[PDB]
Amino acid sequence: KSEIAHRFNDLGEKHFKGLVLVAFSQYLQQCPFEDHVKLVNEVTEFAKKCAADESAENCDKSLHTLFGDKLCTVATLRATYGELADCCEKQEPERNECFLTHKDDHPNLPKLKPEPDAQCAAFQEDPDKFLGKYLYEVARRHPYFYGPELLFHAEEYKADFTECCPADDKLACLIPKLDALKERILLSSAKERLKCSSFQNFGERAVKAWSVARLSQKFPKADFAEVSKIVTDLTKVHKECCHGDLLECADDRADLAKYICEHQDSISGKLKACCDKPLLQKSHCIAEVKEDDLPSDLPALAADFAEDKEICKHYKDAKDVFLGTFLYEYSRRHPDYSVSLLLRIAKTYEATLEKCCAEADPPACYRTVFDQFTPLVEEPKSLVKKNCDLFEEVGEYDFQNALIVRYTKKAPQVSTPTLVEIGRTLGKVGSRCCKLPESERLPCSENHLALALNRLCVLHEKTPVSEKITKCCTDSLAERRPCFSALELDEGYVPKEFKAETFTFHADICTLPEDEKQIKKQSALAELVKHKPKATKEQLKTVLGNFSAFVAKCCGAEDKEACFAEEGPKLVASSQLALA
Ligand SMILES: [Zn+2]
């Protein structure tokens, strides 16, 4: 009878309030913490009152109706949120689509700078407030964050503080832990955003093909029915989270974990560790679980997908099912391939059938279909060996610099902060993937590149500046990384006029932590490319090295600002000449 009462009962007050706080924090990203808390309470009160009597007036209403209504009660709505006040005129489901349109993927709130001393205070004083504030701060910065997973990270955040606040040195215990968690948040946010972006820009079909590939690699022991079952269920979970249906998303996610763990012997040997854990840890562990050992009994695939003389009938009758089976089969056999590569391979398999079956003798045509994959494997394997050999020679910073030069040339109309963010992210892929066992690099590299390129595309949706970026972002999800890689210098771009202040440093840089020092330098590097787009990466590397030396010198000076004042302009003048 009442969906809100039902969900409150399934989920419990703690998680219910957690998810509702996250939901409201993502839709309304500028509201102060105390405004959202009270909205959560009001809605939770309504749920308890409905749970007492489901036939009561308004308890029949949908979750979108009840949450949307509550968000539209908020004080100073039209002033703080001009556009969302317009959404409040509309009824559901129109109102929710409108809300979703207005989520801000670049809110530009301050960095969460961890103050161990002042935070341990607030955690001791009121943990429910302090833990709650963490949900709100992370969620508003990442408005598409996977809600149940954010409740999970809040539990790690609680645990870091529980361990580190009683200790003598708060910083040395806590800082490395909070730094690790911020990295995990970044990555996880980027994973969920790609899933939402796929729904948005390519629909549920692409989300399913993607999931079939990955889950098949993860669970090669599972049969096509079990894989299909989990994909269907997992797809509905993320469709709900991305659509904002956060309570439904959490409940269906718990259910799927239960199913998976009930059939763990069938699905995968690696689940045993995951399935002996509390529910949030459980689901997290399943989502991140290592791929299973390859089964000895895997079938030869030529006979069904190449030699069978009735493939054109199977393909014509049940295109969706037949190709699904191919993708499942090929992917469970290839955990050494990236997901995108498998989806390129699947598309090539389909293309080979479309062509061969329209022609007189299809069996002779499609007999060589597996051999059309060989070329597609080479291009990404070289790209990874090439960029891993560079990473290992030069290290993270210079690698990031290579990538910032490379992407700024591809899209010099993009804002410097975006180019710097993406280049840095693309460069962290080296630190994550190149150290790994050699079979794991390709999937790791390409999978993490997909996350970073989606971030570029998501920002480009907001602030479109480049026809080239648009095409790569919108054409084909699978072809996206190869499309980007194939861009050379944009030669319709007009060199940005030189502005001395852009390349002018002052002694303020010297106090900054190292990562922020690099960002300034890297920002100047992006600006160098925009000014001199035809300059080779090797010229730019030399000029930036001269800037770094200059900076290192004047930071080490007695009269720091007099050094920047005299030495700075000289280097600015001669920097122009080395880029011609
Ligand atoms: Zn919905």
Side-chain angles (χ1 to χ4, degrees), residues 27 64 96 100 239-240 243-245 248:
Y27 278 75
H64 282 320
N96 190 58
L100 289 179
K239 195 193 175 207
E240 283 162 344
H243 204 243
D245 292 294
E248 299 97 318

mmCIF file of all heavy atoms in Angstrom, residues 27 64 96 100 239-240 243-245 248, ligand 1:
data_model
loop_
_atom_site.group_PDB
_atom_site.id
_atom_site.type_symbol
_atom_site.label_atom_id
_atom_site.label_comp_id
_atom_site.label_asym_id
_atom_site.label_seq_id
_atom_site.Cartn_x
_atom_site.Cartn_y
_atom_site.Cartn_z
ATOM 1 N N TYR A 27 20.856 16.501 -5.258
ATOM 2 C CA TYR A 27 19.915 17.314 -6.049
ATOM 3 C C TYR A 27 20.071 18.807 -5.752
ATOM 4 O O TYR A 27 20.066 19.622 -6.675
ATOM 5 C CB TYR A 27 18.474 16.919 -5.762
ATOM 6 C CG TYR A 27 17.918 15.703 -6.480
ATOM 7 C CD1 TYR A 27 18.260 14.403 -6.110
ATOM 8 C CD2 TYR A 27 16.959 15.859 -7.468
ATOM 9 C CE1 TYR A 27 17.694 13.298 -6.748
ATOM 10 C CE2 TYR A 27 16.392 14.767 -8.112
ATOM 11 C CZ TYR A 27 16.759 13.490 -7.755
ATOM 12 O OH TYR A 27 16.179 12.419 -8.402
ATOM 13 N N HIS A 64 9.411 9.593 -5.726
ATOM 14 C CA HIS A 64 9.675 10.828 -6.484
ATOM 15 C C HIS A 64 8.731 11.977 -6.115
ATOM 16 O O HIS A 64 9.160 13.113 -5.966
ATOM 17 C CB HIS A 64 9.594 10.567 -7.996
ATOM 18 C CG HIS A 64 10.810 9.900 -8.569
ATOM 19 N ND1 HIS A 64 12.090 10.225 -8.174
ATOM 20 C CD2 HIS A 64 10.943 8.962 -9.535
ATOM 21 C CE1 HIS A 64 12.956 9.501 -8.855
ATOM 22 N NE2 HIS A 64 12.287 8.726 -9.688
ATOM 23 N N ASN A 96 11.192 15.278 -11.855
ATOM 24 C CA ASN A 96 12.451 14.602 -11.584
ATOM 25 C C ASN A 96 13.434 14.696 -12.752
ATOM 26 O O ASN A 96 14.626 14.858 -12.520
ATOM 27 C CB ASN A 96 12.247 13.139 -11.179
ATOM 28 C CG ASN A 96 13.530 12.512 -10.653
ATOM 29 O OD1 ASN A 96 14.109 13.007 -9.684
ATOM 30 N ND2 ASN A 96 13.998 11.441 -11.300
ATOM 31 N N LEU A 100 17.109 16.370 -12.553
ATOM 32 C CA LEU A 100 18.298 15.631 -12.949
ATOM 33 C C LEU A 100 19.125 16.408 -13.961
ATOM 34 O O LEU A 100 20.349 16.447 -13.846
ATOM 35 C CB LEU A 100 17.930 14.244 -13.477
ATOM 36 C CG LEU A 100 17.428 13.225 -12.445
ATOM 37 C CD1 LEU A 100 17.102 11.922 -13.146
ATOM 38 C CD2 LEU A 100 18.430 12.985 -11.331
ATOM 39 N N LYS A 239 20.441 1.796 -12.974
ATOM 40 C CA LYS A 239 19.400 2.634 -13.593
ATOM 41 C C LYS A 239 18.637 3.418 -12.512
ATOM 42 O O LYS A 239 18.321 4.592 -12.705
ATOM 43 C CB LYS A 239 18.429 1.795 -14.426
ATOM 44 C CG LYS A 239 17.562 2.591 -15.383
ATOM 45 C CD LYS A 239 16.431 1.726 -15.928
ATOM 46 C CE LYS A 239 15.455 2.516 -16.794
ATOM 47 N NZ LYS A 239 14.082 1.921 -16.797
ATOM 48 N N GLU A 240 18.368 2.772 -11.377
ATOM 49 C CA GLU A 240 17.626 3.416 -10.273
ATOM 50 C C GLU A 240 18.457 4.440 -9.528
ATOM 51 O O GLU A 240 17.975 5.542 -9.250
ATOM 52 C CB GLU A 240 17.072 2.370 -9.307
ATOM 53 C CG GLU A 240 15.831 1.654 -9.845
ATOM 54 C CD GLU A 240 15.520 0.343 -9.139
ATOM 55 O OE1 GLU A 240 16.398 -0.210 -8.418
ATOM 56 O OE2 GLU A 240 14.384 -0.137 -9.322
ATOM 57 N N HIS A 243 18.950 7.409 -11.800
ATOM 58 C CA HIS A 243 17.678 8.135 -11.916
ATOM 59 C C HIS A 243 17.276 8.813 -10.612
ATOM 60 O O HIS A 243 16.319 9.556 -10.572
ATOM 61 C CB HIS A 243 16.535 7.233 -12.386
ATOM 62 C CG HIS A 243 15.411 7.970 -13.054
ATOM 63 N ND1 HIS A 243 14.123 8.005 -12.555
ATOM 64 C CD2 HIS A 243 15.391 8.708 -14.187
ATOM 65 C CE1 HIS A 243 13.362 8.723 -13.358
ATOM 66 N NE2 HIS A 243 14.107 9.165 -14.353
ATOM 67 N N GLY A 244 18.005 8.545 -9.542
ATOM 68 C CA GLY A 244 17.707 9.135 -8.253
ATOM 69 C C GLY A 244 16.814 8.310 -7.352
ATOM 70 O O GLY A 244 16.535 8.687 -6.228
ATOM 71 N N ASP A 245 16.378 7.167 -7.847
ATOM 72 C CA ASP A 245 15.553 6.231 -7.080
ATOM 73 C C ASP A 245 16.448 5.551 -6.029
ATOM 74 O O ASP A 245 16.703 4.348 -6.133
ATOM 75 C CB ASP A 245 14.970 5.161 -8.029
ATOM 76 C CG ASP A 245 13.961 5.724 -9.005
ATOM 77 O OD1 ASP A 245 12.902 6.162 -8.536
ATOM 78 O OD2 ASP A 245 14.195 5.705 -10.230
ATOM 79 N N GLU A 248 15.022 2.477 -3.676
ATOM 80 C CA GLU A 248 14.861 1.298 -4.538
ATOM 81 C C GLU A 248 16.227 0.733 -4.912
ATOM 82 O O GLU A 248 16.431 -0.481 -4.899
ATOM 83 C CB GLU A 248 14.065 1.605 -5.812
ATOM 84 C CG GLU A 248 12.639 2.098 -5.589
ATOM 85 C CD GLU A 248 12.495 3.620 -5.642
ATOM 86 O OE1 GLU A 248 13.364 4.345 -5.090
ATOM 87 O OE2 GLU A 248 11.501 4.092 -6.238
HETATM 88 ZN ZN ZN B 1 13.128 7.270 -10.899
#
